[model samples]
Target: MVLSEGEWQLVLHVWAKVEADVAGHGQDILIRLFKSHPETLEKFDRFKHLKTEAEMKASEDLKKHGVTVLTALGAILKKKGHHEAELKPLAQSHATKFKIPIKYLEFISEAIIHVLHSRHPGNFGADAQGAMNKALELFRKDIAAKYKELGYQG
Candidate 1:
């Protein structure tokens, strides 16, 4: 299911929000997505339950990387239009390394937008959708770079 530019923008804005330290936001997003699209639960769980200590640590490390990358990407996008050049390579890298398909990426984006809309509807007005899409692209790219650095390759 290829995403339209509007849909991708919505996803990216939501991804940027995830980088913030909102209490329980991550869990909230996951829960909301699962509830809204129950069939997606299995896919969510696959990414959620990666295992014990190593997974937890890896998750933390990835979050840190995301924060940095998302911040930079947001600044750039705010100044320019959605910069695919700044994002696509990262997505390709992540896809190659974690073997995470584009489908999972779509799921993540949809979940984040739904969750954010539920939590802060006013903030996520129609205009914000484009931001979301750009953020999602940046996020996938960051994940790809991180996984590659960690020695992962599809």
Candidate 2:
């Protein structure tokens, strides 16, 4: 399903509101993701070696990687929902080369939403939150379709 105009607007608006601090917010999002699902940390070569949460949180590598992920999400949002073309290569690499589970997309999405809401209480109300979730789901679906097309087992 396509994102409604309202959905697009809400997501874009709130995303812009958090633009100035995207890096920190992204870092927080990853921290939330790892904390809630420590098993997923093993999926990251750069961070799997981190034995403690403190070390993981302090890793500049993780900080930079967080920006990479969050900026990619921003790119998807900037597309205003017609993102399948851009997402295809991502699906290929993530599914075939990286071997990441599709489930982690949902995990990351949850972390992003949770971090955004907690970090900017005034900017993320129910309507905006709903829109963001639906928007990210659309991205997830696009990538999943490409994954299947590429015969990715994961």
Candidate 3:
């Protein structure tokens, strides 16, 4: 869970790209993500009723929490020789609320990277790849522990 500096940068970079992409074409991205990863739909409620203003507002609020998590992960990644302490809490929170498997968390990171690069081929480059790798590594480490805590592991 304690990410290397490189891993932290990757999380920030991917999150930045996701925020930009979502702001520009979030509805499209959500549609695609749901279509491609239907299981992810379970993570949110009322998947079909998201177009309402209240739903949109609620979605945005959830996104803000996600942004906070990403920011905290980034900060933890930036510090030198940090342990998995920060990640454990986050993993626990998600596990308790969403019961998201560690595997899906890993998948989310991959899905984000995949969607981003596929949509913006020219935007992602070697630097982006490196960052993504680090972020994925860190995500795996943290989520793996989460899985163990949740009585599932592979």
Candidate 4:
């Protein structure tokens, strides 16, 4: 909500670059997330069998779930308001159902921005990078608040 019009334009440009293949890009982000923070995998019972990065990358379940997540985020990006409201169900599941930590929520955003930066390299300009960071920061805060509302201390 706080992002300026110019920032949103920049952010949308980055999204447009990968939106055509969000599943692939999303999987890439998740792989990077798990690679950098393996402990986060403990919360995903369905993915516990994936003992290595290679194994995780090969899992169809992982790929499909990644697609689901990125698809939702893409939808949110287009609508862009009541961030907490849009994320309520997701926060509820993470808080009570999955019991995922807030740190992991924060980590996922980092992984996404990291992927956007690394995937495109020189093409991902500073303006777009900063815009995505700011946009995701807002999303992170709103989702975290929803978690708190559901009595999740973390």
Among the numbered candidates, top lDDT falls to: 2
Per-residue alpha-carbon lDDT of model 4 for 1-154, expressed as tens digits?
4888888887777888878898899789989988999888788888977888789878999999999999888777765554555688888888899888878878888899889898876657887888888888887788777877789947
List all candidate RMSDs to the true structure.
8.1, 1.2, 4.9, 1.5
Top-TM-score structure, candidate number: 2
Ranking by TM-score: 2, 4, 3, 1
Q: What is the C-alpha lDDT profile of model 3 across 51-114, one tens digit per residue?
A: 5434544576545544554556555544433546776776666777667776666666665566
TM-score of each: 0.45, 0.94, 0.60, 0.92
In candidate 1, what are the lDDT values of residues 1-154, reduced to their tens digit? 1345765566556545655754345555544444565554454344555443345344654345434534554554443344545555565545553465555666767876676777767668776765665556655555555556645533
By descending lDDT, how would the candidates be arranged? Answer: 2, 4, 3, 1
lDDT of 2 by residue, 59-105 (tens): 89888998888788788789997787778778888997788878988
| Candidate 2 minimal-lDDT segment of 10 residues | 81-90
Give each model's whole-structure lDDT: 0.55, 0.85, 0.59, 0.82
Evaluated at residue 45, the lDDT of candidate 2 is: 83
Give candidate 4 misplaced runs (Cα > 4 Å).
none
Question: Which of the two, 3 or 4, has more TM-score?
Answer: 4
